[PDB]
Design a protein around this ligand. Structure first.
Ligand SMILES: *[C@@H]1O[C@H](CO[C@@H]2O[C@@H](C)[C@@H](O)[C@@H](O)[C@@H]2O)[C@@H](O[C@@H]2O[C@H](CO)[C@@H](O[C@@H]3O[C@H](CO[C@H]4O[C@H](CO)[C@@H](O)[C@H](O)[C@@H]4O)[C@@H](O)[C@H](O[C@H]4O[C@H](CO)[C@@H](O)[C@H](O)[C@@H]4O)[C@@H]3O)[C@H](O)[C@H]2NC(C)=O)[C@H](O[C@@H]2O[C@@H](C)[C@@H](O)[C@@H](O)[C@@H]2O)[C@H]1NC(C)=O
Ligand SMILES: CC/C=C\C/C=C\CCCCCCCC/C=C\C/C=C\C/C=C\CCCCCCC(=O)O[C@H](COC(=O)CCCCCCCCCCC)COP(=O)(O)OCC[N+](C)(C)C
Ligand SMILES: *[C@@H]1O[C@H](CO[C@@H]2O[C@@H](C)[C@@H](O)[C@@H](O)[C@@H]2O)[C@@H](O[C@@H]2O[C@H](CO)[C@@H](O[C@@H]3O[C@H](CO)[C@@H](O)[C@H](O)[C@@H]3O)[C@H](O)[C@H]2NC(C)=O)[C@H](O[C@@H]2O[C@@H](C)[C@@H](O)[C@@H](O)[C@@H]2O)[C@H]1NC(C)=O
Ligand SMILES: CCCC/C=C/CCCCCCCCCC(=O)O
Ligand code: NA
Lengths: 280, 100
C-alpha cells in the first residue's frame, strides 16, 4: 500500500527563564499533519474527519488528558531541576514519539528527545537511554526519570501497545485521502551556470501525491546521470514540488528531455522536450 | 544545545507562473534553530495580510521548518518576496520570488 506508514507526535518546549515555558505539539502521518495541539484549551485539534482513527471518544479523551498532564508536568519538573542540571536559559527541548509499519507487517516504535537541537535521549526496550551528545546531563536525566512512579510504564504502553493499534486504525480510517493519487504538472526552464559556454536546465514537477516520484533528464532512452535533484518541498494541501537540474554545455542541450514517473500516471510518463534557440 | 542555525528560505509558486492567472506563492523556511521566528510574505515590498502557515514541525536533525503561503496572481511587474527574522539574522532577510 502507498502513502504514509508512520504516526508520531512531536513536542517543542521553549524555556525562557525560571518561570516561563511554552510547549507546541502536533500529530503526524509521515510529514502530513493530522492533529494540532491547542495550548488555549489543553486539547487536541483533529485536522481531518478521520483523525481519531478507530479510537472511541473516551479513549481519545484519556489520551488528551495524558498529554495535557504531561505537558504541564514536564515544564514544571524541568524548571524544578534546571538548577541541579546546570541549565542556562533560554533553552529549547524537542521530542518525537510514535511507531512505523514496515515491509512484512512489523510495527516498530520510537521515542527521541533533544536539548539545544542535539540528541539527548531515546527510549529503547522501554528503558531511558542517554545519547552521547547529551553527556552526563542526559545520564542524570535518565537516572532521574525512572524514579517517577508510572511514567516509564505509561510510556511503554503508549509506544508498544497503544500506538500500533492507533496507527493501523487511522491508516484505514484515512485511506481515501492517504492513498489518493494526484497527478503532478511539469514544466521546463533554464538559467545561467558559472561554466564557460554552459547553462543549467530545470525540470519542475509539482502537485503530485503520494510523495515518491522519479524525475530524470534524458537523451532518448539514456538517463543523464548528471541529473541533480533539489529538495522535495511542500505545497499546502498535501502535494509536493521537486526540481531536477542538469548542467550542460551550450551546444549540447539539444536532444534533452525530462521524464517524470509517478504512481498516479498509470504508466503514461510525462515527457517534456527541451528545444533550442528560445523555442520554450 | 549551544549553536544556533540560520533559516534556509525557499520561495516558489505552486503552478508555473502565467501573468493574470491565479496561483499560490509558497515560502518554505527550514533548517533553523531555535524555533522563535517571524515570517511575512511581501507584495511590492508591502506585507501581505491574508497569509496561512503551518504549525511548527522539525526534521530528523531537529531543525525546525514552516510553510507560509498565499493566493496571488503574478503579473509582469509585480514583485513578491518572503521576509524572515530570526535570532541568527541581524536584520530581516528578504528572498524574492524568481519564476526563472
Ligand atoms: C483498532 O484497529 C486495530 C487494528 O484492527 C485491524 O485492522 C484495522 C485496519 C481493521 O481492518 C480492523 O477490522 C482490524 O481488526 C485493532 O487492533 C487489533 O485488534 C485485534 C482484535 O480485534 C487483534 O487481533 C488479536 O490478535 C491476537 C494476537 O496478537 C498477538 O500476536 C500478534 C501476531 O500474531 C501480534 O501482532 C500482537 O501484537 C500480539 O502479540 C490474537 O490472539 C487474537 O485472537 C483471538 O481473537 C480472535 C478474534 O479477534 C479469534 O479469532 C481468536 O480465536 C482468538 O480468540 C486476535 O487475533 C490485533 O492483534 C490488534 N492489532 C494490533 C496491532 O494491536 C484495535 O482493536 C483493539 O485493540 C486490540 C489490541 C484488542 O485489544 C482489541 O480487542 C481492541 O478492540 C482497534 N480498536 C482500537 C480501540 O484500537
Ligand atoms: C507530546 C504530545 C503533544 C501533542 C500531541 C498532539 C496530538 C495528540 C492527539 C491525541 C489523539 C490521538 C491519539 C494517538 C496517540 C497514540 C499513541 C501515541 C504515540 C506515542 C506516545 C508515547 C509517548 C508519549 C510521551 C508522553 C509521556 C507521558 C507519560 C506519563 O505518564 O506522563 C504523564 C504525567 O505527567 C507528568 O507529570 C510528567 C512529568 C515528568 C516529565 C518527564 C517525562 C519524559 C518522558 C520521556 C521518557 C523517557 C502522564 O500522566 P498520567 O499519569 O498517565 O495520567 C494523568 C493522571 N490523571 C489520570 C489523574 C489525569
Ligand atoms: C520570565 O519571563 C517572563 C516573560 O517575559 C516576556 O516573555 C519573554 C518570552 C520575553 O519576550 C520577555 O521579553 C517578555 O517580557 C516574565 O514575565 C513578564 O514580565 C513582564 C515584566 O518584566 C510583564 O510585562 C508587563 O506586562 C503588563 C501586562 O501584562 C504591563 O502592564 C507592563 O507594562 C509590563 O509590560 C509580562 O506581562 C510578564 N509575562 C508573563 C507573566 O507572562 C517574567 O517576569 C516575572 O513575572 C512578572 C509577572 C513579574 O512579576 C516580574 O517581576 C517577574 O520577574 C520573567 N521572570 C524572570 C525571573 O526573569
Ligand atoms: C512527545 C514525547 C517525546 C519525549 C520527549 C522527551 C524530552 C527529552 C528531553 C529531556 C530533558 C532535557 C533536559 C533536562 C532538564 C531537567 O530535567 O532538569
Ligand atoms: Na511546519
Amino acid at each position: 500500500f502507498q502513502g504514509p506508514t508512520s504516526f508520531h507526535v512531536i513536542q517543542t518546549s521553549s524555556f525562557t527563564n525560571s518561570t516561563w515555558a511554552q510547549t507546541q505539539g502536533s500529530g503526524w502521518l509521515d510529514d502530513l499533519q493530522i492533529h494540532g495541539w491547542d495550548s488555549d484549551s489543553g486539547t487536541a485539534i483533529f485536522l481531518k474527519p478521520w483523525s481519531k482513527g478507530n479510537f472511541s471518544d473516551k479513549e481519545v479523551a484519556e489520551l488528551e488528558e495524558i498529554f495535557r498532564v504531561y505537558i504541564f508536568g514536564f515544564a514544571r519538573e524541568v524548571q524544578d531541576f534546571a538548577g541541579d542540571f546546570q541549565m542556562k536559559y533560554p533553552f529549547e527541548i524537542q521530542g518525537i514519539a510514535g511507531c512505523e509499519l514496515h515491509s512484512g507487517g512489523a510495527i516498530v516504535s520510537f521515542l527521541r528527545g533533544a536539548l539545544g537541537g542535539l540528541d539527548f535521549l531515546s527510549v529503547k526496550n522501554a528503558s531511558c537511554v542517554p545519547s552521547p551528545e547529551g553527556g552526563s546531563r542526559a545520564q542524570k536525566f535518565c537516572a532521574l526519570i525512572i524514579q517517577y512512579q508510572g511514567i516509564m510504564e505509561t510510556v511503554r504502553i503508549l509506544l508498544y501497545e497503544t500506538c500500533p493499534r492507533y496507527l493501523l486504525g487511522v491508516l484505514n480510517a484515512g485511506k481515501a485521502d492517504l492513498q489518493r493519487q494526484v497527478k503532478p504538472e511539469a514544466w521546463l526552464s533554464s538559467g545561467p551556470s558559472p561554466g564557460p559556454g554552459r547553462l543549467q536546465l530545470v525540470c519542475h514537477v509539482s502537485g503530485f501525491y503520494p510523495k515518491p516520484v522519479w524525475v530524470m533528464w534524458m537523451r532518448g532512452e539514456q538517463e543523464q546521470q548528471g541529473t541533480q535533484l533539489g529538495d522535495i518541498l511542500p505545497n499546502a494541501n498535501w502535494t509536493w514540488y521537486l526540481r531536477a537540474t542538469l548542467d550542460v554545455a551550450d551546444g549540447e542541450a539539444a536532444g534533452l528531455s525530462c521524464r517524470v514517473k509517478h504512481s498516479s500516471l498509470e504508466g503514461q510518463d510525462i515527457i517534456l522536450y527541451w528545444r533550442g534557440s528560445g523555442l520554450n | 544545545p549551544k549553536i544556533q542555525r540560520t533559516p534556509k528560505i525557499q520561495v516558489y509558486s505552486r503552478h508555473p507562473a502565467e501573468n493574470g492567472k491565479s496561483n499560490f506563492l509558497n515560502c518554505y523556511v527550514s533548517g533553523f534553530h531555535p524555533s522563535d521566528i517571524e515570517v511575512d510574505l511581501l507584495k511590492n515590498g508591502e506585507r501581505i495580510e491574508k497569509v496561512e502557515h503551518s504549525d511548527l514541525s522539525f526534521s530528523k536533525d531537529w531543525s525546525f521548518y514552516l510553510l507560509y503561503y498565499t493566493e496571488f496572481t503574478p503579473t509582469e511587474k509585480d514583485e513578491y518576496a518572503c521576509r524572515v527574522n530570526h535570532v541568527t539574522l541581524s536584520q530581516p532577510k528578504i528572498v524574492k520570488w524568481d519564476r526563472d
